[PDB]
Amino acid sequence: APATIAAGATGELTMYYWVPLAYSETDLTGAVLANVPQSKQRLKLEFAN
Amino acid sequence: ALINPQFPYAGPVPIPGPAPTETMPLLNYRVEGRIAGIQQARQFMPFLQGPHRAVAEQTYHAIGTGIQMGQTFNQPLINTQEG
């Protein structure tokens, strides 16, 4: 992300987030079995405005 | 089939089902069928039952007649050799 965006300028930003279910790549505590239901998962995201 | 715990596959389609109709009935058919037109014994065809000749043989009749008649000329007499 640009440190500053001057008057009249347009800045381009990139951000990444990891939403964990499993604790880590080797510890599956918290992981979700999703091949067991037709019932949908919901990942709700509210963005800046 | 796979079942996964803890999300288990419901143990049935349960009692909340919507019976939509009672139209289940096929009414038996009752009928009397008569196909009775007068039949006439015969049909016309161009040809039935023939085993037509692909080639015939040559065929003939016969005659002869006449008599035994003749005009003849003979060899001359000759000296006899031996005997």
Curated annotation (Swiss-Prot), chain A:
**Where would you find this protein in the cell?**
Virion
Which residue ranges traverse the bilayer? none
Superkingdom, taxonomy of origin: Viruses
- What function is annotated for this protein? Major capsid protein self-assembles to form an icosahedral capsid with a pseudo T=25 symmetry, about 66 nm in diameter, and consisting of 240 capsid proteins trimers. The capsid encapsulates an inner membrane and the genomic dsDNA genome. The major coat protein P3 and two assembly factors (P10 and P17) are needed during the assembly of the virus particle inside the host cell, when the capsid protein multimers are capable of enclosing the host-derived membrane, containing the virus-encoded membrane-associated proteins.
Subunit and interaction comment:
Homotrimer.
Could you identify this protein by its name? Major capsid protein P3
> Which organism encodes this protein?
Enterobacteria phage PRD1 (Bacteriophage PRD1)
Residues included from the entire protein: 150 to 198 of 395
From Swiss-Prot, chain B:
**Presence of keyword DNA repair:** no
Instruction: Report whether DNA repair shows up as a keyword of the record.
Output: no
Q: What subcellular locations does the record give?
A: Virion
Recorded GO cellular component terms are: viral capsid
Kindly name one Pfam family recorded for this protein. Answer: Tecti-min-caps
Which BP terms in the Gene Ontology apply to this protein?
A: viral capsid assembly
UniProt entry keywords in alphabetical sequence: Capsid protein, Virion
What job does this protein perform?
A: Minor capsid protein essential for stable capsid assembly of complete particles.
What protein is this chain from?
Minor capsid protein P30
Q: What is the lineage of its organism?
A: Viruses, Varidnaviria, Bamfordvirae, Preplasmiviricota, Tectiliviricetes
Could you tell me the gene encoding this protein? XXX
